[PDB]
Design a protein around this nucleic acid. Sequence first.
DNA 1: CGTCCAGTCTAC
DNA 2: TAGACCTGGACGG
Length: 266
Amino acid sequence: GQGPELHLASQFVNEACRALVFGGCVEKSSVSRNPEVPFESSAYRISASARGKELRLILSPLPGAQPQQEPLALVFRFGMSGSFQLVPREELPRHAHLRFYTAPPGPRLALCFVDIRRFGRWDLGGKWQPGRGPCVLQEYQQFRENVLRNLADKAFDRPICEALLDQRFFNGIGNYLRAEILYRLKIPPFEKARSVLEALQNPDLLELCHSVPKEVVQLGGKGYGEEDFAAFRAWLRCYGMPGMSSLQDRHGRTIWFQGDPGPLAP
DNA sequence: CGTCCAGTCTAC
DNA sequence: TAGACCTGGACGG
């Protein structure tokens, strides 16, 4: 997932879990190299928030719950294929790598972090990743200022299409988003980032870093629901669209665009 | 059957 | 940085 997917995932967890009580342990799959979640309570609620490309689950025991302990926070990064599902306890999907089980009684459900490729990671501790910039979705003015106020930084030496993936400044922006954002302003992807952003001292390039992902959020769903996917493929104008160019950036990631590749092309 | 394609993280 | 980390779907034979 990118910003939209992480945000929609957070809304999914909060709606799904609003009226559920969890109890017992936090089960990890045998295959997962992420840490055991050292947490057990007779009764806890789960809530989520997203910030950029990270999602924070908070495990909050009910007053009286045993053992007495304080809330525990986990941050997830999804990598290529992470997601959350609320499933029947005895019908876990494949690659359900972390599972929270609803308490005795009630219909026995499991909230599962599902990650086919296992590129996703989780950390004990609620801290956002130090060095990630503010969320392009929920912290727009802070994100905007964090870029224009630090254009001297060497990150802006790189092609704009590469800078847009630097989560220190574009926390939430990933591959389809950079293609879709640049196509809307017909900016060559290998224009120098500083050159494009100097200008901004018309929805402009930093506004699109906010408004474009917000469009994806308003599409809704996307595993949070199959025509959900069709609605997305329809929304796309550039990424993987017939008649568009593609190149490799210097980290081997495919940028989609129309026309002028731009000066710093390989 | 095979090939090729789809975001960190970390060792050097 | 260059390579590591994984599965599954879309292809072509």
